[PDB]
Amino acid sequence: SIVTELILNADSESRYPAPKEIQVYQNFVKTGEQRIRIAKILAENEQRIVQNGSARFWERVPNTPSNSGNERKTASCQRDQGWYIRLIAYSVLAGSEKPLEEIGTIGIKEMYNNLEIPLRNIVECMRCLKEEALSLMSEEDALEVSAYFDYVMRSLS
Amino acid sequence: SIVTELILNADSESRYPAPKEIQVYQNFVKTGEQRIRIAKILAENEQRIVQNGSARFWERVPNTPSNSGNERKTASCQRDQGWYIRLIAYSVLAGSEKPLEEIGTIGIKEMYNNLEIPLRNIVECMRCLKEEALSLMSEEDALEVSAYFDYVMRSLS
Amino acid sequence: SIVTELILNADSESRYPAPKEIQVYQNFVKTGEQRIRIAKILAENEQRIVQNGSARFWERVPNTPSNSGNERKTASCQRDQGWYIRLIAYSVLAGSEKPLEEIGTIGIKEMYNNLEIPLRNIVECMRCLKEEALSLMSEEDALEVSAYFDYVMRSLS
Amino acid sequence: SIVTELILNADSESRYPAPKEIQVYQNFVKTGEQRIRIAKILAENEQRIVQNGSARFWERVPNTPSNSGNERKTASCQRDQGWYIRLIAYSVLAGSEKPLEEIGTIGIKEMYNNLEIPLRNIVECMRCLKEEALSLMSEEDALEVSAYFDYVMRSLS
Amino acid sequence: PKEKIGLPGSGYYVGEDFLTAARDPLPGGFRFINVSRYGAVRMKRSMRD
Amino acid sequence: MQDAITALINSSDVQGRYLDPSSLDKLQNYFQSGDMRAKTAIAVSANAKNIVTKTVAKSLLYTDITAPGGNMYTCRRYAACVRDLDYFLRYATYAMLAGDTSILDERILNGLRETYNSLGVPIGATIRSVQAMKEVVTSLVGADAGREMGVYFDHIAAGLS
Amino acid sequence: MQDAITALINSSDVQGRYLDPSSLDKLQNYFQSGDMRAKTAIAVSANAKNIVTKTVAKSLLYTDITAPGGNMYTCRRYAACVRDLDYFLRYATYAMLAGDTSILDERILNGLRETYNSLGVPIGATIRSVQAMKEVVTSLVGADAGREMGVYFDHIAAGLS
Amino acid sequence: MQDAITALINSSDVQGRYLDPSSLDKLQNYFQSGDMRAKTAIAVSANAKNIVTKTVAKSLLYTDITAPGGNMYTCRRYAACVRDLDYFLRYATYAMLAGDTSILDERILNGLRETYNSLGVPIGATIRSVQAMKEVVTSLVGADAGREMGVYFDHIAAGLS
Amino acid sequence: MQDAITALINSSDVQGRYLDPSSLDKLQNYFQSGDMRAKTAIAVSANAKNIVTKTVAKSLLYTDITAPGGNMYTCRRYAACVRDLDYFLRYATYAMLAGDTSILDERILNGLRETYNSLGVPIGATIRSVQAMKEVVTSLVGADAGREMGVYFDHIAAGLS
Amino acid sequence: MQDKLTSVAKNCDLTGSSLNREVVETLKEFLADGEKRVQVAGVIGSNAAEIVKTAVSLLFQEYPELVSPGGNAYTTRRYNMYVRDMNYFLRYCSYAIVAGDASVLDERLLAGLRDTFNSLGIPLGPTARSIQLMKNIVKEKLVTAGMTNITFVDEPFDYVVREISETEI
Amino acid sequence: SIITKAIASADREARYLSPGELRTIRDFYNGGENRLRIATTLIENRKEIVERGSLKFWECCPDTPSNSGNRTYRASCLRDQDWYIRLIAYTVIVGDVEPLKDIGIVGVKEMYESLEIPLRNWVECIRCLKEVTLDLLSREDAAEVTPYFDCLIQGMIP
Ligand SMILES: *[C@H](C)[C@H]1/C(=C/c2[nH]c(/C=C3N=C(/C=C4\NC(=O)C(CC)=C4C)C(C)=C\3CCC(=O)O)c(CCC(=O)O)c2C)NC(=O)[C@@H]1C
Numbered sequence A, B, C, D: 001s002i003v004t005e006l007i008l009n010a011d012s013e014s015r016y017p018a019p020k021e022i023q024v025y026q027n028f029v030k031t032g033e034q035r036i037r038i039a040k041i042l043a044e045n046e047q048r049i050v051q052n053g054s055a056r057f058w059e060r061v062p063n064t065p066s067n068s069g070n071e072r073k074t075a076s077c078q079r080d081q082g083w084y085i086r087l088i089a090y091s092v093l094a095g096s097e098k099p100l101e102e103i104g105t106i107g108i109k110e111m112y113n114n115l116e117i118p119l120r121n122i123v124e125c126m127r128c129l130k131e132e133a134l135s136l137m138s139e140e141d142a143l144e145v146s147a148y149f150d151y152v153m154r155s156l157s
Numbered sequence E: 001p002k003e004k005i006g007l008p009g010s011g012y013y014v015g016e017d018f019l020t021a022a023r024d025p026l027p028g029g030f031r032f033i034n035v036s037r038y039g040a041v042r043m044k045r046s047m048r049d
Numbered sequence F, G, H, I: 001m002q003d004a005i006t007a008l009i010n011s012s013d014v015q016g017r018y019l020d021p022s023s024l025d026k027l028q029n030y031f032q033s034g035d036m037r038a039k040t041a042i043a044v045s046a047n048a049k050n051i052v053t054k055t056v057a058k059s060l061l062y063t064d065i066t067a068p069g070g071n072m073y074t075c076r077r078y079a080a081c082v083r084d085l086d087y088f089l090r091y092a093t094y095a096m097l098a099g100d101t102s103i104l105d106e107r108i109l110n111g112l113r114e115t116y117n118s119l120g121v122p123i124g125a126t127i128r129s130v131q132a133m134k135e136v137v138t139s140l141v142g143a144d145a146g147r148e149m150g151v152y153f154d155h156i157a158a159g160l161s
Numbered sequence J: 001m002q003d004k005l006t007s008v009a010k011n012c013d014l015t016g017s018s019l020n021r022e023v024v025e026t027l028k029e030f031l032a033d034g035e036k037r038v039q040v041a042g043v044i045g046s047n048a049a050e051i052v053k054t055a056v057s058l059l060f061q062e063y064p065e066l067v068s069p070g071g072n073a074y075t076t077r078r079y080n081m082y083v084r085d086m087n088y089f090l091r092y093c094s095y096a097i098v099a100g101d102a103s104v105l106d107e108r109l110l111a112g113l114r115d116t117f118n119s120l121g122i123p124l125g126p127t128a129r130s131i132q133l134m135k136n137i138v139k140e141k142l143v144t145a146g147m148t149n150i151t152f153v154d155e156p157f158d159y160v161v162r163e164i165s166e167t168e169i
Numbered sequence K: 001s002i003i004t005k006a007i008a009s010a011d012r013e014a015r016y017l018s019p020g021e022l023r024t025i026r027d028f029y030n031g032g033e034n035r036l037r038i039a040t041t042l043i044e045n046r047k048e049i050v051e052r053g054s055l056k057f058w059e060c061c062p063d064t065p066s067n068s069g070n071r072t073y074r075a076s077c078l079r080d081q082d083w084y085i086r087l088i089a090y091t092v093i094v095g096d097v098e099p100l101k102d103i104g105i106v107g108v109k110e111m112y113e114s115l116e117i118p119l120r121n122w123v124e125c126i127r128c129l130k131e132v133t134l135d136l137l138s139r140e141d142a143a144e145v146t147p148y149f150d151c152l153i154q155g156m157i158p
């Protein structure tokens, strides 16, 4: 999390946390209720977001391995969408993209190239998922969620 | 300033500011008015802080160059106390200990060892100044001022 | 000892001791009787050196932890003086400041800062001990002892 | 020179010379008169040393470029012998092999390979010169002379 | 002028112990200057001048 | 690197004085503008790739620079030019966030002319590309934030000329 | 390393599941305790040298460990022990601020027993010093924060066992 | 670097001849002065920090250099000036031991002027500081050894201009 | 590393007492033997290559160890064995001059057996060659110095066993 | 050196955007304040000696050690140099106010100023303080004269300080 | 510009700007908006100006490198004509010939002699451009614009 980042930054200089790092830590822990609320919204609406994003994404990309008549491929794509929503919820909880980056971004291109899933299609699906997810967030809540969706999309492309 | 730290943190990764950096920046910008008020309080009350802190410091640590009957040494010590209050005011304005670190903390041990001023005495004087400065502000106003005073004290040890 | 120092110097270039190192070795072993005599002088007169040096030191620096009414602190300071005389005797026997460096110079500042003993007070005490020790030695026998006392004082400052 | 060696050794550690290094310096400067006498001995007897060593070297190694009937080659070999005697005198003066190694030992194999002079023959000539030089000197003075001749021979082999 | 005593490195204080170191006709219409009304600052200026 | 607050603190510190009312007013102005600065930084970050794409399209594409023998010929040089435009955009955003141009002086313009002349990079084409990028950013973030970003874009362009 | 939030995230992630209500309650506990943890970290940072001085005075000084033949004999080994106590204090502060003991396990107690055994460092003396450090910090900061830091001090002592 | 013995050796070596009687006399002079040089080096080593403290107090304290906005203002610049003075003292001691100023030219002076000009360090102030250091050393050691060390201090001062 | 004088000093220092008369007598014995030790070191330095070639000629040559498939077959393995023997001789000379075997245990024998076992170097042949080197050195430097060096040669052989 | 109009006109050709909307808007904004710039310059020129005298007196009040023995303003020689240089600064700041551009300060005031001040040992802290005092006095005089929007008057002085002061953070 | 000239004149004499110079500067700052309008008119109509003037110039001066069948020469000539029209507009913004002189009058003869382009042909082209420009300007605006055309012509004449 961001707390780990502050601790490691302090440890790199072999010193106690500086006032700036303590201020960042306090600002982060001040927003825990909001982060938990956002994660709860993401968890409760995960399947609805997946369904709406899948509908939009299959409208945008008709010839994709998910929409190719294979039920297992469709199920795997929708599970991937759910997993990425879960990772974004983790990142919202942690205050940084570290959980999402460590779980579903490092080596994402290699994994999806091995699976023969075109990365442009996944970027489009992430775009649709982001549009569906941001509609359930208030204006003050959408900054981090949109940033983490953008992080996934940038890692894929 | 905290803004410079955020920008340099983003530049270290060759990326635009992440949502965590943006949130830190926005919080600091919001608190800027309170920071200006605290800096004004420190500026307008500097002399009485120096006088009361010096009285307490000489009561607690009578064996100091500033308490050796030398008018010039006493004047220099009180000028140093005023300078450190000014640096703490700068840091309060900037939202980070960067001004205090750059002007009065890096190389503080070498400078005061060259001047043959005991460092424990300067730590005690900083503690007395912190005690006298914290009494002039609210608890939330004192939250950061105490941190900067502690930063000076830690750098002197 | 100087023997180990010259062996390590020869080994750093992966060659047998050159005539310069051999001459150093010969000049060291030719002064063994003198070094043993000086070490015996230091050992025999250690107590009187400690007492006279401590008297002069307390005259010159009255305000120091070794005379504040604490019997244990006074005993510890006089024990430290005796220990440093012993280390200087070791250095005289070895022909190098290495024994003193390993036993009582590496990390001397950290140890005495943990004990909250001012370092300049210890420098003054070592100066008084040097004055006492060199006054019971020959003019030519005082060179090495003075050098080792200077080494202690320089390591403290 | 050993003085340069001590100073550079102290400088690599960014510290003033240690008491052992000061003792080495004092012992070296103490023996300057004997070094000057030995260097004068080598300078006065250089020609007869070269002549006798050349006679022995040509008796022992007749198949050498010196005595192949080329007057210029013979003169160059004699000049090289004189030059190495001079460098050994320099090293005796400096108390170290640094003059000899920096003027006629570093790159000696490359130079004599480019000149197409067999290195074994040069080693034999150096041995003959060492024997001749040790003849015209007391053993105590010849210690360093033999050491530096051996240094040249090792550098050539 | 005041001598600067006890400067660092002067040996005035031994160790870290600082307590024991102690123990012609005037021109026409000339008007004089009243010291009290002239002020301490201007008087110090004049005397140092 | 210095931002607005650090610059004011430096100016007050060389005089050994607390911030005077004029510098305090400047500091209050910076604090008031901070929200717009953060919004502009977010907007530029969200559209950085599109900004550089439009800049290249409207200032460099289909000219002799991208033709063979031009400095944007071959894929490596094209990618390097795009990377340089990314550098300029990112550091202009940094300078806008800080409210001070010192970052561009210490990290962009120092030795840039010598480096470009050594590599053969066209200085005038770079200046025109920076102008195009400023126009694109202004069209994207509006007139006021566009002018604020254009201050630092113009600082870069003036340093290059 | 790992902190409380990352520990809960990794616990939920190994099951492919969101944060269950118990984990969300624990996360709320950590978020509520964050300000106290920051206060404790600031307090411990301010008096680190004093804490180590008091620990050494009340647990190691004037014992057989500092006499000749003891492991704290000679200034080098005294300084090594002091910096070891400094490491223990700093990394206990790190663990307290993070809310997890993983940093202690991966930075402090990573073969520390083997190193101490090979060097001859007394394990019992070090454990006593850690207990004294915990008591000193508890006196410094208070009761609740004292036991909060004592959790990680006891973790270090248990790891040394 | 190069000391007196190496200087005489090289002077003889460029001509390809043994040391002439004048060079032998100079070498004997250096050998006889070695004892005084060693004593001076010991004295300077013992009181190096005190020498630098007295130098700073004599030439730099309570001037406009240490006042706010000065070059020795802030603690880091004060410590940097002290570090430079320490370098000057140590290398003057080296040169005095060697009997030659070659090490001073090689290690200290070759580029110091341009470095100081780039940094904004006042060269006149540092020359006055070096002269004050020469005075402090000649007061600590004596007249003859003070003059011998002042030779190299003067060489440093001349190389700084 | 540690030599005889340092060993005595450490033995006295572990008890916090000056050197007792027995230690002083041992120190005097070492000082008296130093001249012979230096003479032996000079002789071994002069005849190092001869010692190693005689060792190889009388120990390892014309056996199965140099025939194809042996550990001294190929030029690189022969050179490695010669280099190892040179190391043994040089560090035995270091140990003889120091009067202690600590240098041997620190620079040579620390893990040497494990390394030789990993490479397949025959330990018995190495011990035999060390014995041959001891005999050669004894022949070169005489009886007393021969056994003085043989002490450290036997220490090397025991460390290899 | 260049004034604002010259620099803008040359940049019009340099940048390739010609006379677009942003350039026209900046030109109109600058020309709106031209009369005020001329008025400010007239006020500065009409009261130059008073401004410099007031600022130097306040400087010696805030730095009493400057005029004491060993100070940099010690003796009338150095006092006259102080007054002369402060007049230099005021004159070139008035030039920069008229021109609307800082190139005059760059070319004729700040080029080599740091080298000269390092050579002569002139302290930069008091120099910045004196420039700021002159700026404050000019602002007071402008307020007395009735001027209202005089923000641009701050620009030269502050700029000069930022150019001469050392980097502290 | 006149502002720069006045500042330089004051600086030479180590004096502040005199009241007369300040009055002159104030007058030009007052006229700045009118000059900006005139320059905007020049810029908005530069393409028609260049088109008509180039046709007239090739009619009156046919034996010129641009009128020789080389596409590159003709394109460069048209680019130069547009360049000079824009430079005259910018120097009208400033209000004095200084920017136009600094960019395209000092060394123009040397530049076009190195390029092997006759300067009399350039004078003819600038005359044609001046005539076309005067066709679309009022007499009052022409009084502001024409002297810069004349300055360019004088700087181009061998
Ligand atoms: C007072 C809390 C303690 C103390 C003070 C004391 N100070 C001096 C002299 C100096 N102090 C400074 C300090 C600074 N210079 C900087 O650039 C900064 C960063 C902003 C600081 C804090 C300096 C440079 C000096 C040297 C003199 C000068 O100003 O030029 C003295 C020495 C007085 C003398 O001349 O003997 C003293 C005693 N004394 C105490 O007892 C307190 C613990």
Ligand SMILES: *[C@H](C)[C@H]1/C(=C/c2[nH]c(/C=C3N=C(/C=C4\NC(=O)C(CC)=C4C)C(C)=C\3CCC(=O)O)c(CCC(=O)O)c2C)NC(=O)[C@@H]1C
Pocket (backbone or CB within 6 Å): C064, C065, C066, C067, C072, C073, C074, C076, C077, C078, C080, C081, C083, C084, C103, C104, C115, C117, C121, C122, C125, G061, G062, G063, G066, G067, G072, G073, G074, G075, G078
């Ligand atoms: C006397 C010259 C100065 C002084 C000394 C002082 N020392 C102590 C206590 C200790 N001193 C040591 C010293 C050493 N440990 C080592 O390993 C070595 C190297 C061989 C040395 C010199 C130690 C370990 C202690 C701790 C107690 C113990 O011995 O177990 C004190 C008392 C500390 C206290 O606060 O109780 C004092 C006062 N004090 C002066 O004022 C003199 C300048």
Ligand SMILES: *[C@H](C)[C@H]1/C(=C/c2[nH]c(/C=C3N=C(/C=C4\NC(=O)C(CC)=C4C)C(C)=C\3CCC(=O)O)c(CCC(=O)O)c2C)NC(=O)[C@@H]1C
Pocket (backbone or CB within 6 Å): F057, F060, F061, F062, F063, F066, F067, F072, F073, F074, F075, F078
């Ligand atoms: C065709 C297989 C695919 C495709 C191509 C496409 N390219 C462009 C435009 C450009 N292409 C290049 C290419 C290169 N520049 C180089 O230096 C090299 C290596 C030698 C190459 C291959 C460039 C520079 C351009 C920019 C235009 C220019 O001429 O300067 C376009 C037009 C894009 C636009 O108009 O913006 C297209 C369409 N498009 C497809 O659909 C194919 C898959």
Ligand SMILES: *[C@H](C)[C@H]1/C(=C/c2[nH]c(/C=C3N=C(/C=C4\NC(=O)C(CC)=C4C)C(C)=C\3CCC(=O)O)c(CCC(=O)O)c2C)NC(=O)[C@@H]1C
Pocket (backbone or CB within 6 Å): G065, G071, G072, G077, G078, G080, G081, G082, G084, G085, G087, G107, G108, G112, G115, G119, G121, G122, G125, G126, G129
């Ligand atoms: C003090 C409480 C006790 C003590 C300490 C002691 N330790 C050593 C040596 C080492 N200590 C460590 C520990 C760490 N190093 C790290 O980097 C970290 C993590 C940040 C830890 C925990 C290590 C690795 C060593 C060995 C290497 C080294 O010395 O740097 C010594 C020195 C022992 C020696 O013989 O050299 C000592 C004395 N000893 C006591 O008796 C105290 C009870």
Ligand SMILES: *[C@H](C)[C@H]1/C(=C/c2[nH]c(/C=C3N=C(/C=C4\NC(=O)C(CC)=C4C)C(C)=C\3CCC(=O)O)c(CCC(=O)O)c2C)NC(=O)[C@@H]1C
Pocket (backbone or CB within 6 Å): H065, H071, H072, H076, H077, H078, H080, H081, H082, H084, H085, H087, H107, H108, H112, H115, H119, H121, H122, H125, H126, H129
């Ligand atoms: C002290 C007498 C005066 C003074 C000095 C000062 N120096 C610096 C910084 C640097 N000085 C050097 C110089 C050297 N480089 C070398 O190789 C050698 C020989 C070994 C020397 C002496 C260097 C490299 C620096 C580093 C600059 C940096 O910070 O990177 C400063 C600090 C300057 C700053 O801007 O921070 C100072 C103050 N200044 C005075 O006023 C004294 C008269």
Ligand SMILES: *[C@H](C)[C@H]1/C(=C/c2[nH]c(/C=C3N=C(/C=C4\NC(=O)C(CC)=C4C)C(C)=C\3CCC(=O)O)c(CCC(=O)O)c2C)NC(=O)[C@@H]1C
Pocket (backbone or CB within 6 Å): I060, I061, I062, I063, I066, I067, I072, I073, I074, I075, I078
């Ligand atoms: C013949 C051309 C030259 C010659 C050679 C010579 N060699 C020896 C002895 C040995 N030769 C070897 C050779 C090798 N060992 C290897 O591992 C390899 C790599 C494939 C080679 C080439 C060895 C190991 C020995 C030692 C004896 C043994 O084989 O066990 C001698 C005799 C040496 C002695 O003193 O007994 C000789 C004479 N001599 C010349 O003059 C020719 C130029």
Ligand SMILES: *[C@H](C)[C@H]1/C(=C/c2[nH]c(/C=C3N=C(/C=C4\NC(=O)C(CC)=C4C)C(C)=C\3CCC(=O)O)c(CCC(=O)O)c2C)NC(=O)[C@@H]1C
Pocket (backbone or CB within 6 Å): I060, I065, I071, I072, I076, I077, I078, I080, I081, I082, I084, I085, I087, I107, I108, I112, I115, I119, I121, I122, I125, I126, I129
């Ligand atoms: C010769 C008597 C016997 C022999 C030796 C042999 N050794 C190796 C390889 C190594 N030897 C060492 C030893 C050391 N290296 C050091 O730095 C030191 C301390 C100064 C020592 C003692 C090491 C480390 C190696 C491995 C690395 C290397 O190859 O250099 C070989 C080569 C083996 C191979 O397979 O390459 C040999 C042959 N072998 C015999 O048969 C002799 C009895």
